[PDB]
């Protein structure tokens, strides 16, 4: 039936209430996440095919990169609150994996400052109640789905995307099967 459980997606054993409709997990430390985001542009293509009223939620995770990973989760919370995801995603990916010039919390801050977010603004967001709660939000969502690895995507807290079960003969076909699967699951 073109979409089968256990193929293009799997079904969570214990679904998550109150989860975002479409939730993606990633790490700035994970090469596959870099691929997912800047090479295959999966997020952007999934977004393009989402039904009306359905937002694409993206959360960062802690388990890679030690203390810096946790610092990056807090930084992503800042990016979310200020709405500057599209201005920091690439230079954070490149700073960690390409140039490897992100070695401390201060280096993360430097990226935001060069992207146009002022130091006073960044530090205020960093210490804000909203970023504090967004950090907990990202951590809880990961625990709630019993996250095993990144990148990963979840629909309505019930469905885990399974690209390993999709057609990968060509990348354009693959990305569109991914987006269509997300779209299908969102109406399910």
């Amino acid at each position: 039936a073109q979409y089968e459980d256990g193929k293009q997606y799997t079904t969570l054993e214990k679904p998550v209430a109150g989860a975002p409709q479409v939730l993606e997990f990633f790490s700035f430390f994970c090469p596959h996440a870099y691929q997912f985001e800047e090479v295959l542009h999966i997020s952007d293509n999934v977004k393009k095919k989402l039904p009306e009223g359905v937002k694409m939620t993206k959360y960062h995770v802690n388990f890679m990169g030690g203390d810096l990973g946790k610092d990056l989760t807090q930084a992503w919370a800042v990016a979310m609150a200020l709405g500057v995801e599209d201005k920091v995603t690439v230079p954070l990916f490149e700073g960690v994996q390409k140039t490897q010039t992100i070695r401390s919390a201060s280096d993360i801050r430097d990226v935001f400052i060069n992207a146009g977010i002022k130091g006073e603004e960044y530090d205020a967001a960093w210490n804000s109640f909203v970023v504090k709660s967004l950090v907990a939000q990202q951590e809880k969502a990961a625990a709630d789905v019993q996250l095993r690895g990144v990148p990963a995507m979840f629909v309505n807290g019930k469905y885990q995307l399974n690209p390993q079960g999709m057609d990968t003969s060509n990348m354009d076909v693959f990305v569109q099967q991914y987006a269509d699967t997300v779209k299908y699951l969102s109406e399910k």
Binding site: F29, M64, L147, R148, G149, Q164, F174
Partner: peptide, 7 residues
């Protein structure tokens, strides 16, 4: 294209 970093 389906690879992941697992915990």
């Amino acid at each position: 294209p389906f690879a992941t970093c697992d915990s």
